[PDB]
Paper text:
Thus, mutant peptides bound to an MHC protein must overcome self-tolerance to constitute immunogenic “neoantigens” which induce T cell responses. Two non-exclusive mechanisms by which a mutant peptide can overcome self-tolerance are by enhancing peptide binding to MHC proteins and altering the structural and physical features presented to T cell receptors (TCRs). Here, we explored methods to improve the accuracy of peptide-MHC structural modeling, focusing on nonamers presented by the human class I protein HLA-A*02:01.
We crystallized and determined the structure of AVGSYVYSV bound to HLA-A*02:01 at a resolution of 1.9 Å. The peptide adopted a typical nonameric conformation through the binding groove, with valine at position 6 serving as a secondary anchor and facing down into the groove. The decoy with the lowest Rosetta energy deviated from the actual structure with Cα and HA RMSDs of 0.46 Å and 1.09. A key error in the structure with the lowest Rosetta energy was an incorrect positioning of the peptide backbone from Ser4 to Val6, reflected by a 3.1 Å error in the placement of the Tyr5 carbonyl oxygen.
Author numbering:
A (entry chain B): 1 to 100
B (entry chain C): 1 to 9
C (entry chain A): 1 to 275
Write the structure that this text describes.
C-alpha cells in the first residue's frame, strides 16, 4: 500500500518574546495513510490542552493537519512535537527552535 | 454548498 | 482576481472498530468555512468561518442532509472497491474525493473538477471538458462504464457550472473582508554559522495570504534549486501563512547569495541581499 512520511514543522504563530503569550504550532503535511499521532511537549511532558484542524489533503492526495496550543515562551522552557506514523520506526521528536 | 447527490463507484 | 471553492472528503474503513470514519471540509480559496466529522456528537455540518454563520436553518439542515448522503455513498464505495481489488475485510482502506469550481476576474466559471482517489492513488477523474473521464486502472474503467451509462458527468457538470459558482459568488460577498484580501509577505533573511567555515542562510516569508508563493535562492544569479531546503507552506493559525527556504554556504560567500520572493500582494518581486 502507498505510504508517505509526515513532514513535521514546529514553530510559533508570532515571533517569540519571553513573557508574551503566543501560539505553538505543530504542522504535519504530506503523509499517507491518515492515521497519525501528534503530541505537543513542554519540557518532555505531553500538553493535554491541544486543538487540531479538520483533516484535509493536498492536490497529490497527501494529508495535512495543524496541532496548536496557546503558550507563553520563557528562557528555560523546551517545547517539541512528537509524531508517530506507520512510516516511522519510532516516534519522531522535533524540537522548537526559535533562533531559526 | 455541496452537491445534492454523488454516485457510487 | 480569480477565486475557487473546493470540498474535500475523506473516508477510512476501520474493520471491527466501527463504521468508517468520514470527514468533509469546505474551502473558499485558502480559507476553510465548513466541516463535518462522523465521530463528533453534533452529526451536523458546522460553521468554521464567521462569515458563514449568517446562513439560515434551511442551509444547515440541507448541507447536513447532503453531506450524510456523501458519507453513505463512500460507505458503499469502500465495499465496492474491496470487491474490485479482491481485498480482505481485515485491512483499512482510504477513499478521497475533491470537487469544486474556479471563477475568473469577471467572477464567472473558469473550470471545474471532480476527482477520486483510492488508497492515495488517482482512481477516477472528470476531465477538464467535464464530459469524459480519466480512469487510472482496470477497476476504475468498471466505474467509468457504470458512470457513462448513468450519465453521471452531465449531473456533475450542472452542479459545477451552476450551483457551485452561484454559492462561491455569495460567499465571496458575505466574507468580503476575509476572502477579497491580499496580505503581502513580511520578508527577511537569517544567518547562522554551523561551523568555522559554513553558514545557514534562511529566507523567510511571514504573514501572507493567499498561500501561493515562490521563494528562490540565487548564487551569482544562478538558481540553487538542488541545494535549497524548501519547507511546505504552513498556516500561522490566524488566517495567514509562512514559508522559508535555506541554503548552507561557505563562510565569506554570503554576498553571492540572494533570495527572491514572488507573491500576488507584492507590486513587484522582491530580492533580498546580504549587502
Amino acid at each position: 500500500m502507498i505510504q508517505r512520511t509526515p513532514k513535521i514543522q514546529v514553530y510559533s504563530r508570532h515571533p517569540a518574546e519571553n513573557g508574551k503569550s503566543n501560539f505553538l504550532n505543530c504542522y504535519v503535511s504530506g503523509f499517507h495513510p491518515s492515521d497519525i499521532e501528534v503530541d505537543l511537549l513542554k519540557n518532555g511532558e505531553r500538553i493535554e490542552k491541544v486543538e487540531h484542524s479538520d483533516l484535509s489533503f493536498s492536490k497529490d492526495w497527501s494529508f495535512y493537519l495543524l496541532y496548536y496550543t496557546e503558550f507563553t515562551p520563557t528562557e528555560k522552557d523546551e517545547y517539541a512535537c512528537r509524531v508517530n506514523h506507520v512510516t516511522l520506526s519510532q516516534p519522531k521528536i522535533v524540537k522548537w527552535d526559535r533562533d531559526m | 454548498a455541496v452537491g445534492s447527490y454523488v454516485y457510487s463507484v | 482576481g480569480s477565486h475557487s471553492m473546493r470540498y474535500f472528503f475523506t473516508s477510512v474503513s476501520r474493520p471491527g472498530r466501527g463504521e468508517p470514519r468520514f470527514i468533509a471540509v469546505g474551502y473558499v480559496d485558502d480559507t476553510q468555512f465548513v466541516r463535518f466529522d462522523s465521530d463528533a456528537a453534533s452529526q451536523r455540518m458546522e460553521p468554521r468561518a464567521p462569515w458563514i454563520e449568517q446562513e439560515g436553518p434551511e442551509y444547515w439542515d440541507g448541507e447536513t442532509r447532503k453531506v450524510k448522503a456523501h458519507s453513505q455513498t463512500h460507505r458503499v464505495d469502500l465495499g465496492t472497491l474491496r470487491g474490485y481489488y479482491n481485498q480482505s475485510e481485515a485491512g483499512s482502506h482510504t477513499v478521497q474525493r475533491m470537487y469544486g469550481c474556479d471563477v475568473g476576474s469577471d467572477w464567472r466559471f473558469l473550470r471545474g473538477y471532480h476527482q477520486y482517489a483510492y488508497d492515495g492513488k488517482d482512481y477516477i477523474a472528470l476531465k477538464e471538458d467535464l464530459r469524459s473521464w480519466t480512469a487510472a486502472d482496470m477497476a476504475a474503467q468498471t466505474t467509468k462504464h457504470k458512470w457513462e451509462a448513468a450519465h453521471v458527468a452531465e449531473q456533475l457538470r450542472a452542479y459545477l457550472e451552476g450551483t457551485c459558482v452561484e454559492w462561491l459568488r455569495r460567499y465571496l460577498e458575505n466574507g468580503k473582508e476575509t476572502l477579497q484580501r491580499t496580505d503581502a509577505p513580511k520578508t527577511h533573511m537569517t544567518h547562522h554559522a554551523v561551523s568555522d567555515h559554513e553558514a545557514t542562510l534562511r529566507c523567510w516569508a511571514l504573514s501572507f495570504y493567499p498561500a501561493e508563493i515562490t521563494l528562490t535562492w540565487q548564487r551569482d544569479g544562478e538558481d540553487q534549486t538542488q541545494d535549497t531546503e524548501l519547507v511546505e507552506t504552513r498556516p500561522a493559525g490566524d488566517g495567514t501563512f509562512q514559508k522559508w527556504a535555506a541554503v548552507v554556504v561557505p563562510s565569506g560567500q554570503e554576498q553571492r547569495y540572494t533570495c527572491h520572493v514572488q507573491h500576488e500582494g507584492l507590486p513587484k518581486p522582491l530580492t533580498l541581499r546580504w549587502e
